[PDB]
């Protein structure tokens, strides 16, 4: 999906880890990493294994694709994407030498769609909607940008009352992320912007 690719690109631009995982709707998980292209290296030279809780360890079929380098990734079976439980991940070379090792909580690696329907009007009041098709909107926190000036919004709040200059065109944009403490993750893309000539 162009959505996974764009969200993966967003995460890959930030890291900080090499082995990156993100969920979109807390019922899914994709983990990926990037390395230099080696002529003899395909998914066969790596094993992706994981254990949830004390269940039998499982293997995940590795996929691969070029990038601007080579990206390996695995898409977890939905049955194994439960929240609030240790998901222990391992990537192991064919020799048995460990490559990556990470425990993650799915609820802590949320990457949402961007907010939609941004609108501004003169009272400058800024309003928007949460990412579409996203549960627990009451736990989504936001940040608006003015144009350079960043304003933080409390979770569940979808309005920002904004000092400015007269006869001025202001471009606004919003992005969203799951709010601590029960959830965490990464900033979405910025929303579609809007302009107001003050």
């Amino acid at each position, epitope marked *: 999906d162009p959505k996974f690719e764009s969200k993966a690109a967003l995460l890959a631009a930030r890291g900080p880890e090499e082995l990156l995982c993100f969920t979109e709707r807390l019922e899914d998980l994709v983990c990926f990493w990037e390395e230099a292209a080696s002529a003899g290296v395909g998914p066969g030279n790596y094993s992706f294994s994981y*254990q949830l809780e004390d269940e039998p360890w499982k293997l995940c079929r590795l996929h691969q694709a070029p990038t601007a380098a080579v990206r390996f990734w695995c898409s977890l079976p939905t049955a194994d994407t439960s929240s609030f439980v240790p998901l222990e991940l391992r990537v192991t070379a064919a020799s048995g030498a460990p490559r990556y090792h990470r425990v993650i909580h799915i609820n802590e690696v949320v990457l949402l769609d961007a907010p939609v329907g941004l609108v501004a009007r003169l009272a400058v009041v800024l309003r928007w909607l949460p990412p579409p098709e996203t549960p627990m909107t009451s736990h989504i926190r936001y940040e608006v940008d003015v144009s350079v000036q960043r304003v933080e919004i409390l979770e569940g709040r979808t309005e920002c009352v904004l000092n400015l200059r007269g006869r001025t065109r202001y471009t606004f944009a919003v992005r969203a992320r799951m709010a601590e403490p029960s959830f965490g993750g990464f900033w979405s893309a910025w929303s579609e912007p809007v302009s107001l000539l003050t």
Partner: antibody
Framework: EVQLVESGGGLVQPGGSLRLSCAASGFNLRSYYMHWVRQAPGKGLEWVASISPYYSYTYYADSVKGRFTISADTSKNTAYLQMNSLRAEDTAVYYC??????????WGQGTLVTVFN | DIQMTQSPSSLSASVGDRVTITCRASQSVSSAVAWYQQKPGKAPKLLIYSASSLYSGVPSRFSGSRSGTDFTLTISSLQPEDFATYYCQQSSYSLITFGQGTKVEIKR
């Protein structure tokens, strides 16, 4: 339901050999990391070896590398520790343990290896 | 080679006391730290995993915490069955290592 039952410990000289067994019930041993951990008399816990699920990758403490071998037999649902080139530091109670919750959830009762010349 | 330095090596306390045991990693182990209880003649018992989650059946007076490479096991109100030796463990690397243990003895 889950049980680990060990055996094989005993008195052994250096230049002798021993094979420890760890028979599992209530779970498929091939589907888990299995660990061996030992405890010298009066001392703490020291990890010894690990074997990985499905591929059977093996990992060893430096002090046992090249002398001990961890392995597993799926048919008998059992893990093993083969011990050669034994030394006085090897005298200990050896536990086997299953990997779960990022740790060792289930443990055997231990079997004693005593080294003597 | 990650070192798990446990403090103190032993302590004495009374029933009802709040007991804190500390384990410091020589390098980052993320949150991959577990705590075990052991009594003479018995195998260790998993108490806490991922630094702060309680294993099933462990009573709620046991808690764990992480700050950086600093890991703490706390027993909020020591009970007679809690006198034992406690071990921390990191399993973030394939070379698993344990703390040296902390014996909790009976004060009198």
């Amino acid at each position: 339901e889950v049980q680990l039952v060990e055996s094989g410990g005993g008195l052994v000289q250096p230049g002798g050999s021993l094979r420890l067994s760890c028979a599992a019930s209530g779970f498929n041993l091939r589907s888990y990391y299995m660990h061996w951990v030992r405890q010298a008399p009066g001392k703490g816990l020291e990890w010894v070896a690990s074997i990985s699920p499905y591929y059977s990758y093996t990992y060893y403490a430096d002090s046992v590398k090249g002398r001990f071998t961890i392995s597993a037999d799926t048919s008998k649902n059992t893990a093993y520790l083969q011990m050669n080139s034994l030394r006085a530091e090897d005298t200990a109670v050896y536990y086997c343990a299953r990997h779960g919750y990022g740790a060792m959830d289930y443990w055997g009762q231990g079997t004693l290896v005593t080294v003597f010349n | 080679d990650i070192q798990m330095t446990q403090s103190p090596s032993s302590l004495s306390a009374s029933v009802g006391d709040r007991v804190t045991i500390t384990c410091r990693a020589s390098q980052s182990v993320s949150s991959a730290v577990a705590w075990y209880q052991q009594k003479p003649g018995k195998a260790p018992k998993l108490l806490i995993y991922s630094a702060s989650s309680l294993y099933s059946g462990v009573p709620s007076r046991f808690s764990g915490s992480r700050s950086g490479t600093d890991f703490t096991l706390t027993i909020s109100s020591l009970q007679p069955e809690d006198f034992a030796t406690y071990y921390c463990q990191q399993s973030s690397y394939s070379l698993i290592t344990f703390g040296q243990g902390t014996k909790v003895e009976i004060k009198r």
